[PDB]
Subunit: 183 residues, 3 copies
């Protein structure tokens, strides 16, 4: 019945380019073997806050990585900030370091690490989100499972966008996906 | 009380242009701190029944708003009709039109009401349907949360389309999205 | 509360053109009135294994039919392998096979049988996925409910190859969706 969330405030809690240059809104909810994911991003400061390509054409994609361990707790090298992310209990988070996130992860069976046994997987969930909420302004949230090393589990976000966006602010829409639980 | 749904019987329950010319087969289900949600539409009379752009090239958008009070009871001036909406029980609706849908609403903190605060695009869920079942006939469904006045919560579906169609019936294909729970 | 899936042990259970020449990774979840499905396919052998639209000029579509009876028990004339498909209950298999109980099927009301009534467009849930996880290489995954014959409930998966593409192995990107349950 439980839910594990990043308090959905406008107070930043994620670093891509510079310290807390972004708030990342993710709510992950579990049912048996299937977890439902609702993600949203606002980029409040730095290089990815404003997209002007007519000056900076090279910036047409960047990536975020939620690395976990054997017990499935989020590492602090992970672009996200540890003091915002915890099992929900009303609007509060219950102000104690959690654990026991075994299962909340992308199944190693269904989504294996890139082990020497050479199979080409089908892990990737593509999608889409539009910046400002304008239709004419699309982007490609590419989410990949269990393709980062050092960790046990991993959820990486590979955002791309080809267009010639001048003073578009990086505040996405909301996108919903599910992934297969390890337990 | 697993589901606050429209009985799925394709009997018009919805007024876009004339008194009950559409059926809205919206369905919503509680997953703690998410609300997983499906939506179809059939328009079976009136100005948005058969679509001919050639003749009516300026007609390529319409809207369906739900408006909910402090207690989360669908306000009457909603496009959808109060006497078609309640919790499912088997095939009927638990034999009532209940007084407690608090918990089945879009969180204000997540998708706040209009302020002098910067409104971000994360209020919006972009998806696409297809009319008939033809690949070649898409339109956009853009659902937005708590962006409407005169109410405490609001779920507004805007249907746009961008293709010069000729004599096309507005029956759509199911879609699925989720939004974070107020409680 | 249960999940009704196939063990993702990349062990070809699905037949398209020739016996067990594909692995269909489908996983269904009771979200009460709604099922939360997540689907995938791998072609390890056959014609569809390796696609090349230069030698075979036609870009033939295909299908994957899952027919259930009055109790929701996958008939044996289906494309998938009947043995591999059950309740994990924590990714186990408790050796009991008396399964007359299942609200995992698509409501016959919200999605009727083809003959007994003129048919509407919300039979279907349209999907779009990339083969090889490459943006330039997209396909189409059309899904239909109770649109088969000599059965009681039928979730059939239509795939379509769009453009002309050369020396690609069939491995689709993950895709997520939901429908209205019978009971």
């Amino acid at each position: 019945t439980r839910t594990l969330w990043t308090t959905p405030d406008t107070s930043p809690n994620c670093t891509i380019a510079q310290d807390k240059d972004s708030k990342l809104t993710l709510v992950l909810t579990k049912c048996g073997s299937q977890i439902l994911a609702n993600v949203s991003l606002i980029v409040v400061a730095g290089k990815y806050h404003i997209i002007n390509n007519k000056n900076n054409p090279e910036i047409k994609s960047f990536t975020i990585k939620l690395l976990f361990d054997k017990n499935g707790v989020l590492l602090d090298n992970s672009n996200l900030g540890k003091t915002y992310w915890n099992f929900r209990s009303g609007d509060s988070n219950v102000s104690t370091a959690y654990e026991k996130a075994i299962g909340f992860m992308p199944n190693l069976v269904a989504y294996p690490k890139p082990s020497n046994s050479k199979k080409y997987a089908r892990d990737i969930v593509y999608g889409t989100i539009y910046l400002g909420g304008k239709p004419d302004q699309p982007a490609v949230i590419k989410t990949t499972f269990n393709q980062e090393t050092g960790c046990e589990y991993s959820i990486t976000f590979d955002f791309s966008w080809s267009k010639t966006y001048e003073n578009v602010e990086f505040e996405t829409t909301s996108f919903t996906f599910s992934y297969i639980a390890q337990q």
